[PDB]
Amino acid sequence: SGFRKMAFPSGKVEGCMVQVTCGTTTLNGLWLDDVVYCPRHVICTSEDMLNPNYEDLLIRKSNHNFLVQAGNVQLRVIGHSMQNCVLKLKVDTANPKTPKYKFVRIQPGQTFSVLACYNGSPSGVYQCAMRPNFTIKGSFLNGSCGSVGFNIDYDCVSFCYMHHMELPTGVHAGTDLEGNFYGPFVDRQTAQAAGTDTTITVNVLAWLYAAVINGDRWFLNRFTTTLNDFNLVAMKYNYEPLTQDHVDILGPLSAQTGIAVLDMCASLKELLQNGMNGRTILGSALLEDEFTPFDVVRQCSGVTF
Amino acid sequence: SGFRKMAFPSGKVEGCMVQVTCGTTTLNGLWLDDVVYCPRHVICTSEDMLNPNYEDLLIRKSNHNFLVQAGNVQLRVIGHSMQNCVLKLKVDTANPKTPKYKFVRIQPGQTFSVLACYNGSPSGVYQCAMRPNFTIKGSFLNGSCGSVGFNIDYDCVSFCYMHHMELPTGVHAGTDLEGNFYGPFVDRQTAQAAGTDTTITVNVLAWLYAAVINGDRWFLNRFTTTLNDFNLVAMKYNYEPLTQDHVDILGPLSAQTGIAVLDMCASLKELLQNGMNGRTILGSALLEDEFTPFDVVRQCSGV
Ligand SMILES: *[C@@](O)(CO)[C@H](C[C@@H]1CCNC1=O)NC(=O)[C@H](CC(C)C)NC(=O)c1cc2c(OC)cccc2[nH]1
Ligand SMILES: *[C@@](O)(CO)[C@H](C[C@@H]1CCNC1=O)NC(=O)[C@H](CC(C)C)NC(=O)c1cc2c(OC)cccc2[nH]1
């Protein structure tokens, strides 16, 4: 028993982290097969990052201008190309520790493990959830760019995040492994503000299913609702609307408890309108929204990779 | 910026996790050099676990009674010994992934990373704290025994915990790598209660400093308190006493924020007496006590 924020075992990703340096600018890169992926602003000087023209700045660079190191061992760069905001550097060595992997673009509310790295050395791992405003409430210091977020199913690692930016509010923004930013942010040295955030409804519902599984079910009422009616009410409380995919991924938890998805939506709707009334759920008076239905099943069922 | 429950990278430990089976009892083992460490109750049947005379059950076991599997390869046990509640299985093959390691016993209030495993396969990693009553609030299911907790310094893994049991209240208990339990627990199949838990005061203060470093200051106040007057109120709320060593350890966080430790103590006193209302600190509605001063320093230095 017990419910904690659980990250994936990071060994498969640790063996792929390297350091990329251009001049004095250094950050982290991801070494898969014979290609190293990293943020493209590594080619920028400190003054360049204010208003960079990555097309013009990359024209002046050659393969021999890139320092890629696995620890202290240099990997000779034999080719370079740019894809959106990520740099792809071909190296002369195929990473023997390359795991079965895939590049995926996650949705808001989806969670992933972040392997915080500095100078190509992994330092920590923790769970993050993509907020509806396309930010993540992470923990990043100087030199953390290049750090990746990932999910692991069976023996396959699904990379979904590469770190780029810290907003003035202390939250963080990045791209997928194809260089496309999550949200409307750009890789420039400017103060960028994110939209107003909302609560991840599908994850709150998953957290309620988790409580029911553990015998905590006072909040179950005899009401039901339509998906459209619930979505309209939920937005009034700064809650995200549910998609068809959200209803589907809640299927297993619904079948395990015998509580239909729309019935639990009606239960959640009551909690939003009348409040919690001095009671708690799973020991907390706050509704938790950073546990996905998979996170609840994976933790309540001990799945392995 | 930002502050999160952060664990060490588990790669160095993943390369040491194996599966140990004896009869129909299966759990996790830790493979270091040519030795496999696992909880000794693996030699017990379901009926043996009720009242096990481990010295008796062990002498009746043979090397071939232990099935050790490392991935898809079976390791041959060429020797077996017992150190307290930890079984030591000597194998004929040395683990090539064995990192630089040490076995240490953690103190209450200290944190460590847990690599939860099932059937010898790593499943998840998270950070725990050794509660003053020598329990931990983890996430363990059936088959989690054998899972270890650890810290990493440079390239050295310091193993400090191996999981054994879950109390009726939902918290968990285990031993160090020498087989000695943390707390007054025994590896028998009985419902066991822990001592009254207290709050790790030095950790709460460090976490309040992390909140100030990240822009949370609503709980601060202009008042100050003496160390003894703070401890009087703290003990009243089942908080652990704050020593001068704790005050010294919080020094770096005090210098970075410019808030004296005894000033933060006055803030915590007000929080304990008045509560938090509906407000939150670092997204939490409760006072967090599982972050050590060094945990805060590592994440908020230079911010
Ligand atoms: C990477 O390590 C850079 O390689 C670094 C990561 C942040 C540093 C501190 N914590 C982090 O997560 N990223 C940056 O410094 C980026 C560089 C961009 C992508 C070119 N810049 C920011 O994150 C940034 C710039 C500014 C700013 O300007 C002016 C004003 C306010 C906030 C801000 N954040
Ligand atoms: C191991 O996986 C067993 O190898 C298991 C880990 C717990 C299982 C559930 N969640 C866990 O962390 N440990 C146990 O099952 C141990 C067995 C040995 C002999 C210590 N037992 C318990 O944890 C346990 C037994 C009892 C009990 O009896 C009667 C009554 C109430 C609680 C309880 N916990």
B170: nearest CB among A1, A14, A305: A1
User: Which of B164, B175, B185 maximizes ligand 2 atoms within 8 Å of its Cβ, making it the mutation to test the pocket?
Assistant: B164
Best residue of A117, A127, A142, A171 to probe chain B, by most B CBs closer than 10 Å: A127
Q: Rounded to the nearest whole angstrom, what is the distance from the C-alpha of residue A1 to the centroid of ligand 2? A: 11
Tokens found for residue B269 = 């006193």
Residue B248 and residue B114: Cα distance in Å, rounded? 28
Contacts of B280 in chain A (CB under 8 A): 286
Count Cβ–Cβ pairs < 8 Å, chain A vs chain B.
Answer: 127
CB neighbour list of residue A25: distance below 8 Å, 6 or more residues apart? A41, A42, A43, A44, A45, A46
B41 is catalytic: yes
Cβ(A40)–Cβ(A51) below 8 Å: no
Shortest CA distance from B13: residue in chain A? A11
CB neighbour list of residue A266: distance below 8 Å, 6 or more residues apart? A221, A223, A224, A225, A230
Cβ(A36)–Cβ(A91) below 8 Å: yes
How many CB atoms are closer than 10 A to CB A271? 18
Q: Name the residue at shortest CA distance from atom 4 of ligand 2.
A: B145
User: Which of A22, A123, A166 maximizes ligand 1 atoms within 8 Å of its Cβ, making it the mutation to test the pocket?
Assistant: A166
Residue B261 and residue B269: Cα distance in Å, rounded? 12
Cα of A294 to nearest chain B Cα, Å: 13
For residue B151, the cross-strand partners are B158
Q: Rounded to the nearest whole angstrom, what is the distance from the C-alpha of residue A102 to the centroid of ligand 2? A: 38
Atom of ligand 1 nearest to the CA of A188: 20
Atom of ligand 2 nearest to the CA of B27: 4
Q: Rounded to the nearest whole angstrom, what is the distance from the C-alpha of residue A5 to the centroid of ligand 1? A: 27
A166: nearest CB among B1, B170, B215: B1
Atom of ligand 1 nearest to the CA of A144: 2
Tokens found for residue B192 = 């066991």
Q: Rounded to the nearest whole angstrom, what is the distance from the C-alpha of residue A164 to the centroid of ligand 1? A: 7
Contacts of B172 in chain A (CB under 8 A): 2
Ligand 2 neighbourhood includes B188 CB (under 6 angstroms)? yes
For residue A20, the cross-strand partners are A27, A68
Closest CA to A268 of A197, A222, A210, A219: A219
Which residues of chain A approach chain B closer than 8 Å at the C-beta? 1-12, 14-15, 115-116, 122-126, 128, 137-142, 166, 170-172, 284-286, 298-305
Q: How far is CA A189 from the centre of its chain?
A: 22
Shortest CA distance from B166: residue in chain A? A1
A141 and B302 within 8 Å at the Cβ level: the answer is yes
Residue B91 and residue B87: Cα distance in Å, rounded? 13
Cα of A37 to nearest chain B Cα, Å: 21
Ligand 2 neighbourhood includes B73 CB (under 6 angstroms)? no
B141 and A5 within 8 Å at the Cβ level: the answer is no
Cα radius of gyration (chain B): 22
A41 is catalytic: yes
- The per-type count for chain B, helices as H runs and strands as E runs, is 8, 13
User: Which of A145, A167, A172, A186 maximizes ligand 1 atoms within 8 Å of its Cβ, making it the mutation to test the pocket?
Assistant: A145
3-state secondary structure A215-241: CCCCCCCCCCCCHHHHHHHHHHCCECC
Residue B113 and residue B126: Cα distance in Å, rounded? 6
DSSP track, chain A: ------BPP-HHHHTTEEEEEETTEEEEEEEETTEEEEEGGGG--TTGGGS--HHHHHHT--GGG-EEEETTEEE-EEEEEEETTEEEEEESS--TTPPSEEE--PPTT-EEEEEEEETTEEEEEEEEE--TTS-B-----TT-TT-EEEEEETTEEEEEEEEEEE-TTS-EEEE-TTS-BSSS--SSSS---PPPP-B-HHHHHHHHHHHHHTT--TT--S----HHHHHHHHHHTTBPPPPHHHHHHTHHHHHHHT--HHHHHHHHHHHHHH--TT--BTTBSSPP-S--HHHHHHHHHT---
Q: Rounded to the nearest whole angstrom, what is the distance from the C-alpha of residue B27 to the centroid of ligand 2? A: 12
B10 and A125 within 8 Å at the Cβ level: the answer is yes
Residue B48 and residue B123: Cα distance in Å, rounded? 28
Closest CA to A48 of A65, A23, A77, A19: A23
Cβ(A113)–Cβ(A125) below 8 Å: yes
Q: How far is CA B254 from the centre of its chain?
A: 27
Torsion of CA A44, A47, A52, A58, to 10 degrees: -30
In this structure, is the dihedral angle defined by the CA atoms of residues B86, B88, B93 and B97, taken in order, positive or negative? positive
